[PDB]
């Protein structure tokens, strides 16, 4: 039984840096790799970030880099981002997802979307 | 194991003079030597270090080349030169005999009787 | 935000073939053997349908067929179904250490 | 500078006075890690021509890393111990799960950091190379293209600078099998060693000494292979700490002292057994019988205290006055009359006896001295070469003042033949009591008859 | 002026335990260097009370107990005796100022 369920989101004020969390169960966590993506209503999917086994080689999008950070824990096996300097454009639904089979650190091997989640909707308003 | 030394007095600033350390250790060749000073008011502060033959001289950052330290092994004694004297130099000066550390460190064990050196006026 | 250009919407009759495509540069969807096509229904999670240019994952129909030529990836379907109204993407590893996506193509039947 | 010795002729021996000991007393451990990537299949169509060095270099790398994965005269009174004790303990600590992950996470961008383990040990961590960046940024975007072709061969040679070192690694751990003396520069270069000397908790004069003598501490230091899991391959260096620095330490050479008896085979004689290094560390002295464990470099000795004797400060008293009631003064006695010679730092001591041609000659005036009988000693700046028996030797030619003190033939103090010649551990007290009891036995035999 | 900082404003009545704490930067104490504590009774020359916080010299009581943790060291005196009026010190080997001495705390009875 493979599932990804998400935590966090909602209405967040401009600014108001937030830590977002995945949750996953029913499989090996340290063995494979997790990652985050977004998509907003009105347009398509936008990649964000990927991590590998343990906390190593934190990959980031070119247009998003600097505004975010990513790290994982091996106790609860829940991937954790922390995003800063929230603009109007971040109103979107965010998805954790899973990929990679072996113990590798190269991004080209890390492009399989084997499972998906449900995402958190985050809206910025005043 | 005790120590005796001399060389204090009231001398004008700016000029050089001689401090002597005449430790009566029967085997004064192995133990590491330091000199420290205590100025009245403020705390005591390390001045100068020397190791055996005298090839690893080190000084506190207050005096870079101002104080010239030496020892003579066969005459079981030690010397310090006050190349320069500032008003801050006045203090009670101490010889101190340190033992070999478990890592490498000077323990600052049994000290000298101290000599007051005064530079004012 | 650079992406991969894609049609806004394509319409096809049931039981018909579509040949939708996306185009980039050499340091993009062009070559490098990272072509991926994805479908997603609204309010549902995205799904792998085509990975690694041509291969297909477990539990997928064989009517899908991904291919590439020059700097253009293409997806072809056979026997269109009334469940295929969805939005589709092409995803590939760009050369600058990132996973670049497409703009989304709406697939509809009439 | 001021090297000296005083060859005693009372007992023919050389005591090289004037040195600084720079003794090691502890082991400083440090983990050095290389990061490296699990490269998959090359994913190339065709062969091309430019991409040939890359493919074989990476295959060599794979073979190397999978092979590393598949890897896992007073001596009878001297002891034995585990020289590799702290480093193997640190590696065994690293065998615990989730420990090396802390090294991997903490040392993510900083070159050197400090982590604390599960047993309160927090020595140091250091990263020697950054193959993550070069592999994932300068190699794999190029080598894993469709119908692969490198941009140029000049992109490969710097990869050589990042790979050949590692290759050094492999065949220097496949030969010595985990423990390596001396430490090669490929585990730790000279500049990186100078960086690490500015890192361990020692005082700055020790830092100056280590910086001045990088090759010596490089010779002394060890290396032990730690774990290999999560592809963060690492090893612990066990470079020596240095407790006492700059105290006198003398080298005691000995030479035979045997009478030139006309009747051969009836010339009993007793020779000193005290060879080695004696350094006055703290209120006692440390004795090393193994001259090979000690090293010398420009008045500066360096020796190990594990195989050391914490002998009392009264060793100079027996050194000057051999007949003193304060030390045992161990001596080997035998009837052998062997022409043998030793070389001290500032001279040569010949003890050629019987019918043996003995010459001290220089290259300026031919021969200059001839040794007839008795133990004799020549200064280094008096002669060049010495011929004894059928063998030649060369004296050291480094500057120092040396003096010969006029002693006495102590062998003539004792009886012409009472000395036993079948013991290999004896002192002046034990031998004196043996002479006393043999004299008592012979006077008892004379009194009974 | 010293990197060793400790409050020289401490006193207590005889009978109880008095704790003295001196802290430093990363380069001293926290860089694997030990701490040495002395005393400064007037008249006779200062001597070491405790060295590297665990082993103690020949003529000392058991009252003095030394400890360190990270960049901070402490010395406690259980059951204060009257003639302990002195000025107590700290020592380390800061990589800048080589043998750095603390300012020293004046301990007296009430």
Short mmCIF file of C-alpha atoms in Angstrom, two decimals, chain D residues 198-205 207, chain E residues 31-33 93-96 98-99:
data_model
loop_
_atom_site.label_atom_id
_atom_site.label_comp_id
_atom_site.label_asym_id
_atom_site.label_seq_id
_atom_site.Cartn_x
_atom_site.Cartn_y
_atom_site.Cartn_z
CA UNK D 198 46.45 24.65 11.99
CA UNK D 199 43.41 22.65 13.15
CA UNK D 200 44.14 20.15 15.93
CA UNK D 201 44.20 21.42 19.53
CA UNK D 202 47.94 21.92 20.08
CA UNK D 203 49.89 24.98 21.08
CA UNK D 204 51.37 27.10 18.33
CA UNK D 205 55.00 26.14 18.89
CA UNK D 207 52.26 23.86 15.09
CA UNK E 31 38.69 24.18 20.29
CA UNK E 32 39.61 21.16 22.41
CA UNK E 33 41.70 23.04 24.97
CA UNK E 93 45.21 28.53 24.69
CA UNK E 94 43.33 30.87 22.37
CA UNK E 95 44.90 30.65 18.91
CA UNK E 96 45.49 34.41 18.90
CA UNK E 98 48.54 32.39 23.05
CA UNK E 99 48.33 31.81 26.81
#
